[PDB]
């Protein structure tokens, strides 16, 4: 049941500021539609910032994976620069039924902390990171200081 699932993630994020997450609702206080927002990974182009993700955790939750679509635009091979969408397959397609959103937004933080062209989202950003280590440090550090405020 989706009602007896999200209110455990809402209270466990409320008690713990050291985990770095806000689960802040899109309606008022429902049981599903969330801005899941993490703090930026330090010593890296994604340091120090609020990384905002819109989330439908679908109707059959605990069993269904989150539809993770970014408001904050991020220049990264696995996370979309143009759309919002993400590639990490056991997070978005092949779910384990007891993963919390407190564990899933800390997975996007660890995906940004050391970039790799392996699970592909925006294809010309994966071509850019294979070619580059100078204009990726120009574009991703500027995009973190503007979009992750």
């Amino acid at each position: 049941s989706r009602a007896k699932r999200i209110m455990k993630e809402i209270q466990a994020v409320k008690d713990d500021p050291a985990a770095h997450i806000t689960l802040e609702f899109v309606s008022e206080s429902d049981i599903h539609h969330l801005k899941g927002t993490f703090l930026g990974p330090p010593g890296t182009p994604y340091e120090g910032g609020k990384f905002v993700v819109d989330i439908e955790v679908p109707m059959e939750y605990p069993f269904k994976p989150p539809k993770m679509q970014f408001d904050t635009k991020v220049y990264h091979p696995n996370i979309s620069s143009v759309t919002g969408a993400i590639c990490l397959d056991i997070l978005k397609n092949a779910w384990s039924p007891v993963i919390t959103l407190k564990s899933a937004l800390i997975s996007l933080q660890a995906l940004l902390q050391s970039p790799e062209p392996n699970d592909p989202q925006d294809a010309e950003v994966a071509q850019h990171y294979l070619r580059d280590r100078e204009s990726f440090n120009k574009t991703a550090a500027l995009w973190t200081r503007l979009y992750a405020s």
């Binding site: 990974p41 990490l88 397959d89 997070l91 039924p97 564990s103 660890a110 902390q113 050391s114 592909p120």
Partner: protein, 76 residues
């Protein structure tokens, strides 16, 4: 020391070590009690990835610390 591996499953893992233990031996002790493939194991610790032919002492991994395990495939 008992350092804690944060999975992408729900099921959370004890890792039985001291600072001499290899990142090789970290990937073998996760394939033991969880079953997770060495190419899926993208391990992350504070500014850094855990590179495979290395020690725990390279990274500043202190007693009872959290290692962040990301399950990274090649497609989705």
């Amino acid at each position: 020391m008992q350092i804690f591996v944060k999975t992408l499953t729900g099921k959370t893992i004890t890792l039985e070590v001291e600072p001499s233990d290899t990142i090789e031996n970290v990937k073998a002790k996760i394939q033991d009690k969880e079953g997770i493939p060495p190419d899926q194991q993208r391990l992350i610790f504070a500014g850094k990835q855990l590179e495979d032919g290395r020690t725990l002492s390279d990274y500043n991994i202190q007693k009872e610390s959290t290692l962040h395990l990301v399950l990274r495939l090649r497609g989705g």
